PDB file of N, CA and C and ligand atoms in Angstrom:
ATOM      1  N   UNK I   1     -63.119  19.965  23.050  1.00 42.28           N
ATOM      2  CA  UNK I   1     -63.840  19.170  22.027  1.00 42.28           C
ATOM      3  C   UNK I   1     -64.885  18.267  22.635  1.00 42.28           C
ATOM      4  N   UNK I   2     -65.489  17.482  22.109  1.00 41.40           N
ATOM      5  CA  UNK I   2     -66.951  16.917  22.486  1.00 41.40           C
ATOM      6  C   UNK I   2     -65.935  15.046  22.803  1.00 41.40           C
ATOM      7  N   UNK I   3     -65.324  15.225  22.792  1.00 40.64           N
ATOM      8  CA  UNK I   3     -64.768  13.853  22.901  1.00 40.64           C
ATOM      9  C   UNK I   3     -63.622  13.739  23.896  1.00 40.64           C
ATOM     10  N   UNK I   4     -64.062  12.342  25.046  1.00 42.32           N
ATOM     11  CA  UNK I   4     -63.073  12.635  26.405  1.00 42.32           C
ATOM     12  C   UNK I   4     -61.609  12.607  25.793  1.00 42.32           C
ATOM     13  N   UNK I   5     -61.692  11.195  24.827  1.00 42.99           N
ATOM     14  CA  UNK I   5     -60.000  11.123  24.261  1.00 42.99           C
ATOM     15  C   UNK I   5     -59.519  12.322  22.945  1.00 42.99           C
ATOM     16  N   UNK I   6     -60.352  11.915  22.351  1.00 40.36           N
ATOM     17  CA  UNK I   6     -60.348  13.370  20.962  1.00 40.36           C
ATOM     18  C   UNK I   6     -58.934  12.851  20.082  1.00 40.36           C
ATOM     19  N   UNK I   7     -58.382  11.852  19.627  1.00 39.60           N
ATOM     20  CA  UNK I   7     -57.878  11.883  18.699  1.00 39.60           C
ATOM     21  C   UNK I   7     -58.788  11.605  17.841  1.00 39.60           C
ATOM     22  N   UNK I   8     -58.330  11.590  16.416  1.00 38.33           N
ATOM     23  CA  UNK I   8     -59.218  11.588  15.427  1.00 38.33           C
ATOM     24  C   UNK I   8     -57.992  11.154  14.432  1.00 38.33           C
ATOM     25  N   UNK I   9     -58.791   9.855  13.701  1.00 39.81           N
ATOM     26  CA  UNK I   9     -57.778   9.328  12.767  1.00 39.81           C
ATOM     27  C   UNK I   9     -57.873  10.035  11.409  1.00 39.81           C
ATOM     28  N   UNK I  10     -56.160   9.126  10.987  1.00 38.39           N
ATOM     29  CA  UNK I  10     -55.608   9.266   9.247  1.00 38.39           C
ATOM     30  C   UNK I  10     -56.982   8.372   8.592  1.00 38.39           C
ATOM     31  N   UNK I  11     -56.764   8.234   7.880  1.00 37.94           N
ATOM     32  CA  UNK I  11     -57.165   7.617   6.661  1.00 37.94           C
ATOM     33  C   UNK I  11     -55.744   6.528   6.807  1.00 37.94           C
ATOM     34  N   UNK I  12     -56.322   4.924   6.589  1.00 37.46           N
ATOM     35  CA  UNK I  12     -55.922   3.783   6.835  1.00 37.46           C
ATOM     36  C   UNK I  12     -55.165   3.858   8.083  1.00 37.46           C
ATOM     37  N   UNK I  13     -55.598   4.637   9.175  1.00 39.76           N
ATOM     38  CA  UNK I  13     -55.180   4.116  10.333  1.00 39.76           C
ATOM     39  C   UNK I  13     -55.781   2.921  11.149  1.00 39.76           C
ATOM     40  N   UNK I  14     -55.028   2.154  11.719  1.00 42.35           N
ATOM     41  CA  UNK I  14     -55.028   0.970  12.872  1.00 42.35           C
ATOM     42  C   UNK I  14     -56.133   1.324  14.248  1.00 42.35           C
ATOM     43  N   UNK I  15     -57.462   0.882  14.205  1.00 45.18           N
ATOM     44  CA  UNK I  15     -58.432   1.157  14.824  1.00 45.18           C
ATOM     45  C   UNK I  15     -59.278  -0.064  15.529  1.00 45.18           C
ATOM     46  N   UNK I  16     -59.860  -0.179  16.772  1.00 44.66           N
ATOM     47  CA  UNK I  16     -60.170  -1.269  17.340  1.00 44.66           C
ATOM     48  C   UNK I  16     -61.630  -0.873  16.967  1.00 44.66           C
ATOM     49  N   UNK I  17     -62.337  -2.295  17.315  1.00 45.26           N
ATOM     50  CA  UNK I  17     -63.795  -2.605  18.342  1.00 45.26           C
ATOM     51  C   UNK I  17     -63.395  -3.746  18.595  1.00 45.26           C
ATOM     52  N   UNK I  18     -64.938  -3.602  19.509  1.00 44.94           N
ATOM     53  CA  UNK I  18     -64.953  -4.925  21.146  1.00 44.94           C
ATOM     54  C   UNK I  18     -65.947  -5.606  20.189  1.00 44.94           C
ATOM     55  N   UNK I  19     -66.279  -7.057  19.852  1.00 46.66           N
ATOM     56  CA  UNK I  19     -67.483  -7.680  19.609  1.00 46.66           C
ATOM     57  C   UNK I  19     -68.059  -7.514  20.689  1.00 46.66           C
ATOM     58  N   UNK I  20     -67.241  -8.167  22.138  1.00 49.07           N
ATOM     59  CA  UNK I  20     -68.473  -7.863  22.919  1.00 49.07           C
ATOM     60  C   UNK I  20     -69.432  -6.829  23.834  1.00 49.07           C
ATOM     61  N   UNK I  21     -68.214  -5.998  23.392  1.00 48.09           N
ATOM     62  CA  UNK I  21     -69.136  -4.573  24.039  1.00 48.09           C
ATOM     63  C   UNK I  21     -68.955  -3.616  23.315  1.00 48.09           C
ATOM     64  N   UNK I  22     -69.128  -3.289  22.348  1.00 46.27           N
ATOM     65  CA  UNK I  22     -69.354  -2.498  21.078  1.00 46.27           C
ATOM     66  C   UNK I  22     -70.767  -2.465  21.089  1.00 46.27           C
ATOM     67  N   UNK I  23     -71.954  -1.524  21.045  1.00 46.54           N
ATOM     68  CA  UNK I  23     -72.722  -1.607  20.195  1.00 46.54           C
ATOM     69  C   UNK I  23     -73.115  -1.947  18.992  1.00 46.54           C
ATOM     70  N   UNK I  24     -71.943  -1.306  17.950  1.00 45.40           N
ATOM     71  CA  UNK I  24     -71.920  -2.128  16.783  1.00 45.40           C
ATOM     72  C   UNK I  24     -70.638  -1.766  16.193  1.00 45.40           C
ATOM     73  N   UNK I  25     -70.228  -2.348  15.007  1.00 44.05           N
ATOM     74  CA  UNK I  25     -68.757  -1.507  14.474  1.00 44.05           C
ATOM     75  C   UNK I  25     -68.387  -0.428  14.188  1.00 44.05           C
ATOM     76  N   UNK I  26     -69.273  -0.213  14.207  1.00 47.66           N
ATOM     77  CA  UNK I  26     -68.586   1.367  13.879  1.00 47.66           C
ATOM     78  C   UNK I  26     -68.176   2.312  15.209  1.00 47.66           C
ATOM     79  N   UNK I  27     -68.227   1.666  16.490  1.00 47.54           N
ATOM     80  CA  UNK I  27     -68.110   2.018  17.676  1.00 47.54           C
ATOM     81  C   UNK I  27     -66.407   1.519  18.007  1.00 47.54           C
ATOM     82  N   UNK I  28     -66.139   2.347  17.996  1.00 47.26           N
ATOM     83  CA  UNK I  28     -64.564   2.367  18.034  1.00 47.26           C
ATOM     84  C   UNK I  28     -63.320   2.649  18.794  1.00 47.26           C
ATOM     85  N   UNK I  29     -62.232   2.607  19.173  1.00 48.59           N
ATOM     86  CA  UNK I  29     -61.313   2.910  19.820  1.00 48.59           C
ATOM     87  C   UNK I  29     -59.692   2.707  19.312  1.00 48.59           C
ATOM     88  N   UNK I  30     -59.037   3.878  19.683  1.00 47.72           N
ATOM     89  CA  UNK I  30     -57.910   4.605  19.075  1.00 47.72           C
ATOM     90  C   UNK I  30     -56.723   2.818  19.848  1.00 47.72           C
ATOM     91  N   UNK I  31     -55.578   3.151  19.452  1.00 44.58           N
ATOM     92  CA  UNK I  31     -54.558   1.813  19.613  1.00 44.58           C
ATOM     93  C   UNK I  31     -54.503   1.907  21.432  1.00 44.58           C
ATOM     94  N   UNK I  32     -54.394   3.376  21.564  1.00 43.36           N
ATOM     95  CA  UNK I  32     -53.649   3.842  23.314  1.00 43.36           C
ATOM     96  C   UNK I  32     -54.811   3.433  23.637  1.00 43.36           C
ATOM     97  N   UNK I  33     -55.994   3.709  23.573  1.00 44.10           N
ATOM     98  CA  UNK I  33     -57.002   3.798  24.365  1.00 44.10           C
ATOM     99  C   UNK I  33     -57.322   1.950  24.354  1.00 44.10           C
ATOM    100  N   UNK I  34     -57.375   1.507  23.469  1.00 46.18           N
ATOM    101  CA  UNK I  34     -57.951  -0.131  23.047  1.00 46.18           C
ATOM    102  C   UNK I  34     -56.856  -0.842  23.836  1.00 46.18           C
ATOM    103  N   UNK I  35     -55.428  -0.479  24.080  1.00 46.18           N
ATOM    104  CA  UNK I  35     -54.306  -1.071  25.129  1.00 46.18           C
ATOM    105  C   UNK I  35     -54.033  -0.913  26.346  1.00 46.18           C
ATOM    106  N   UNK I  36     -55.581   0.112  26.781  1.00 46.45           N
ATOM    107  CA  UNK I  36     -55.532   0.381  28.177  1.00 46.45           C
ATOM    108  C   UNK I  36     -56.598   0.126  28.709  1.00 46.45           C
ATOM    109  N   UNK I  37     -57.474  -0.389  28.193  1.00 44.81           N
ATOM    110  CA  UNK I  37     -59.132  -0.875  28.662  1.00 44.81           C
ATOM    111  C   UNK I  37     -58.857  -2.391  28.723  1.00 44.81           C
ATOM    112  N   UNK I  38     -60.402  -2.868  29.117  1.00 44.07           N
ATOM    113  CA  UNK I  38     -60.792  -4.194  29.595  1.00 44.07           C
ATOM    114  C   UNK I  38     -61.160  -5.119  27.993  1.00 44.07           C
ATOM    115  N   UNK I  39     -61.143  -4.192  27.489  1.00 43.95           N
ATOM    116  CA  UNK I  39     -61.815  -4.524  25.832  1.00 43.95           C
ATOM    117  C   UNK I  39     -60.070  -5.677  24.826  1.00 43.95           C
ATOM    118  N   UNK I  40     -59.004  -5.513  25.645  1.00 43.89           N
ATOM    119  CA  UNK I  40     -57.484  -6.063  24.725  1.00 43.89           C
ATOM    120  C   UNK I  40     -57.724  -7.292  25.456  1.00 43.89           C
ATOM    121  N   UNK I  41     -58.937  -7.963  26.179  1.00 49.56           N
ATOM    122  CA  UNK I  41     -59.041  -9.659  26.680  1.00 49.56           C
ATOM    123  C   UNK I  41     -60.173 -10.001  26.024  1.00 49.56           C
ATOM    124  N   UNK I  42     -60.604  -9.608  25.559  1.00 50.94           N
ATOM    125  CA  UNK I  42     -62.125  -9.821  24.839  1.00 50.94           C
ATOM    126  C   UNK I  42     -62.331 -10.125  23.243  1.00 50.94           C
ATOM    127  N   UNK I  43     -63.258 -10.034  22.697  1.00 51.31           N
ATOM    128  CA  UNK I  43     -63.594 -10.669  21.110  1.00 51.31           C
ATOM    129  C   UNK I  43     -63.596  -9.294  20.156  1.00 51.31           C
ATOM    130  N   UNK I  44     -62.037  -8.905  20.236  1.00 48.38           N
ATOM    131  CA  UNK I  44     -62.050  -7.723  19.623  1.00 48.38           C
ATOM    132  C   UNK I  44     -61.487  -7.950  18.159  1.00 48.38           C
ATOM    133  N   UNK I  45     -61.729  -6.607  17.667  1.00 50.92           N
ATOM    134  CA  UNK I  45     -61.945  -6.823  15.767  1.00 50.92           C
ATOM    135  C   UNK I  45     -61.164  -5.346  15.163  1.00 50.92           C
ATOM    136  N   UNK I  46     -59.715  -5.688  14.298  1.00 48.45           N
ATOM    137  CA  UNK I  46     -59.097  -4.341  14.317  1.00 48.45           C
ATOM    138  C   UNK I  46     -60.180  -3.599  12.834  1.00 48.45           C
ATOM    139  N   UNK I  47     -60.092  -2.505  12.606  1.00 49.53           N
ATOM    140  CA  UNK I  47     -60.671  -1.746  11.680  1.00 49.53           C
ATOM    141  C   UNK I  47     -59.609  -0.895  11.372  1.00 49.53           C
ATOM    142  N   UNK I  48     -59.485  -0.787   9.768  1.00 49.70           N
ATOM    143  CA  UNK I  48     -58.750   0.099   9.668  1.00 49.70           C
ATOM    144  C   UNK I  48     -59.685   1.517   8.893  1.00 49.70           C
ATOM    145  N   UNK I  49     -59.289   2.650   9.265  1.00 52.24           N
ATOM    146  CA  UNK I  49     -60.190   3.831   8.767  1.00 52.24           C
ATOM    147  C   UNK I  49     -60.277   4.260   7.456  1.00 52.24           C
ATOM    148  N   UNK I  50     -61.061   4.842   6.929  1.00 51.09           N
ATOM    149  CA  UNK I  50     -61.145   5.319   5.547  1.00 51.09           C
ATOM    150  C   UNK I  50     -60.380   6.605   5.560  1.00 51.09           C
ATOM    151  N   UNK I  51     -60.385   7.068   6.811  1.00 49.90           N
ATOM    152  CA  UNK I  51     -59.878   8.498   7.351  1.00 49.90           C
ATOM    153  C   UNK I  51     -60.885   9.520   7.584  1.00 49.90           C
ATOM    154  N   UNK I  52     -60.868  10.528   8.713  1.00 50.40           N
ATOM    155  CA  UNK I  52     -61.944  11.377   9.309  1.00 50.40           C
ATOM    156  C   UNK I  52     -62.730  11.146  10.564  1.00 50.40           C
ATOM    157  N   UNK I  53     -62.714   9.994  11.148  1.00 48.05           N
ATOM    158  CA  UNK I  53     -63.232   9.369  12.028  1.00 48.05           C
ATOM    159  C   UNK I  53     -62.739   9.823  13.382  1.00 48.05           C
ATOM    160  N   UNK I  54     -62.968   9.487  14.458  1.00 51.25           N
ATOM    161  CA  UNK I  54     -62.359   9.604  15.918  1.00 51.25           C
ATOM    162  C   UNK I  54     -63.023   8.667  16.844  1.00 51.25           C
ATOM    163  N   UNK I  55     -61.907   8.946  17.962  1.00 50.20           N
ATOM    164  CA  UNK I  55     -61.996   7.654  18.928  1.00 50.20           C
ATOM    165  C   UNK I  55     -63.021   7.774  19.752  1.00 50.20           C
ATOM    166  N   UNK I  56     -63.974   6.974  20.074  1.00 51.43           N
ATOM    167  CA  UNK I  56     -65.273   6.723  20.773  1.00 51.43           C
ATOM    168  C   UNK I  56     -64.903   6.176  22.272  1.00 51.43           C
ATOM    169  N   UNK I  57     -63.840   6.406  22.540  1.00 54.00           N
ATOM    170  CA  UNK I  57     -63.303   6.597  24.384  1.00 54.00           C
ATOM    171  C   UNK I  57     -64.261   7.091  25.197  1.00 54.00           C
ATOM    172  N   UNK I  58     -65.001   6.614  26.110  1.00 57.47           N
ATOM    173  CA  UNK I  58     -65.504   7.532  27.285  1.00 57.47           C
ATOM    174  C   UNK I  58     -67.058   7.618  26.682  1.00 57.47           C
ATOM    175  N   UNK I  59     -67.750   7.390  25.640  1.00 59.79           N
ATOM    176  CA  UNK I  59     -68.832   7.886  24.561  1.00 59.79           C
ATOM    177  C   UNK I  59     -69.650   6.172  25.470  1.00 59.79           C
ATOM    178  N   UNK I  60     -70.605   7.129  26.350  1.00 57.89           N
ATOM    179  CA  UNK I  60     -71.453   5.994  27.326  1.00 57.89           C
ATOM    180  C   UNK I  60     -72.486   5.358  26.624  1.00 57.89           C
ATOM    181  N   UNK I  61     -72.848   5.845  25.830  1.00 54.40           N
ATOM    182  CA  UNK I  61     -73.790   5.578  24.652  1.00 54.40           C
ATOM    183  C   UNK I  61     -73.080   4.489  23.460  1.00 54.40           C
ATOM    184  N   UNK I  62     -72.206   4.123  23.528  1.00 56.42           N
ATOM    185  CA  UNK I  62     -71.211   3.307  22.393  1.00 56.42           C
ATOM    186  C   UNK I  62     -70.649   1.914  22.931  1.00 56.42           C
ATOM    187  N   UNK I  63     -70.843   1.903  24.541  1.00 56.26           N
ATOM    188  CA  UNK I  63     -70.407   0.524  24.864  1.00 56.26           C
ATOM    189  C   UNK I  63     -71.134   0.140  25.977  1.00 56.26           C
ATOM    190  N   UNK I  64     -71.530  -1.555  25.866  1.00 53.76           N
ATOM    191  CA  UNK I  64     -73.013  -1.913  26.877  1.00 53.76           C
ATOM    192  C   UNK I  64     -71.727  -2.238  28.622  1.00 53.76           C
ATOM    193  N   UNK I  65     -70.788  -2.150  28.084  1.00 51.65           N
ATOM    194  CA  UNK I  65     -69.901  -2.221  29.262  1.00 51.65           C
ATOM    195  C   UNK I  65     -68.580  -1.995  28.854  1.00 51.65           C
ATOM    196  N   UNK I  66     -67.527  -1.495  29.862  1.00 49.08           N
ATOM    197  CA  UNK I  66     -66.320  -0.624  30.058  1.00 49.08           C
ATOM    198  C   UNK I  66     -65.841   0.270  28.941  1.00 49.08           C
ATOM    199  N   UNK I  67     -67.107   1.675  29.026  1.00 46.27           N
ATOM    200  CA  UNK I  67     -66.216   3.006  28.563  1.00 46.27           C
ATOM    201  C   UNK I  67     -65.593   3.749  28.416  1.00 46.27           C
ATOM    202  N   UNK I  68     -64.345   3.541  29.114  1.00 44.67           N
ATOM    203  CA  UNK I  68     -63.539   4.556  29.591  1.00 44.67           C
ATOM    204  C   UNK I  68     -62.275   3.416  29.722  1.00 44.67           C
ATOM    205  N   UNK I  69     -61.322   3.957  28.426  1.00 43.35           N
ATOM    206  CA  UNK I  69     -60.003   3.329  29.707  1.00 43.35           C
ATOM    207  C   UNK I  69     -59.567   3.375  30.629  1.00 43.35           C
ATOM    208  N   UNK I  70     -58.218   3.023  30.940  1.00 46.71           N
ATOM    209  CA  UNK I  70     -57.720   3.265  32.665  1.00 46.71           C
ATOM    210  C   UNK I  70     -57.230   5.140  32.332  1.00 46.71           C
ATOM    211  N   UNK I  71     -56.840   5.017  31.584  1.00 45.71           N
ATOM    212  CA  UNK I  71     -56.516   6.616  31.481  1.00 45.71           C
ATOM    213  C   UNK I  71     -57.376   7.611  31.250  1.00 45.71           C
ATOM    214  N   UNK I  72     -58.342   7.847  30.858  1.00 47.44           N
ATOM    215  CA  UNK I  72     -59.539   8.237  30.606  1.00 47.44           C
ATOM    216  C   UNK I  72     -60.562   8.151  31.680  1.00 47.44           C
ATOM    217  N   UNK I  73     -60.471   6.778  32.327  1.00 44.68           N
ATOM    218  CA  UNK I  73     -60.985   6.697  33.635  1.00 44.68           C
ATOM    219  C   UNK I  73     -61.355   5.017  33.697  1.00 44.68           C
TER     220      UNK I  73
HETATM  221 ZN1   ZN V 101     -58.679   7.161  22.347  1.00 44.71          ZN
HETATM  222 ZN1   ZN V 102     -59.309   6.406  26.479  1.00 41.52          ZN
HETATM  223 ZN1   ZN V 103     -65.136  -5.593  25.415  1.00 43.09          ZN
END
């Protein structure tokens, strides 16, 4: 798939962003991925989904700093 992490949410699932390194909100990250990055000390903002969406892990274009979790990279 086109995505390093590739889950892809429910509809009203539990979804992060970073205020400060988000591009903007709609730039996103899954619970595993948002509890393994640099982004769970920072000015983060939960979102919950409408459903259809997926996790923006690793997507270099989506965060002005740390794309990739520790697991992901
Ligand atoms: Zn993820
Ligand atoms: Zn990840
Ligand atoms: Zn951050």
């Amino acid at each position: 798939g086109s995505q390093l992490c590739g889950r892809v949410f429910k509809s009203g699932e539990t979804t992060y962003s970073c205020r400060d390194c988000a591009i903007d909100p709609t730039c996103v990250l899954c619970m595993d991925c948002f509890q393994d990055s640099v982004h769970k000390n920072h000015r983060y903002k939960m979102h919950t989904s409408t459903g259809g969406g997926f996790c923006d892990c690793g997507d270099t274009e989506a965060w002005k700093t740390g794309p990739f979790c520790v697991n992901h990279e």
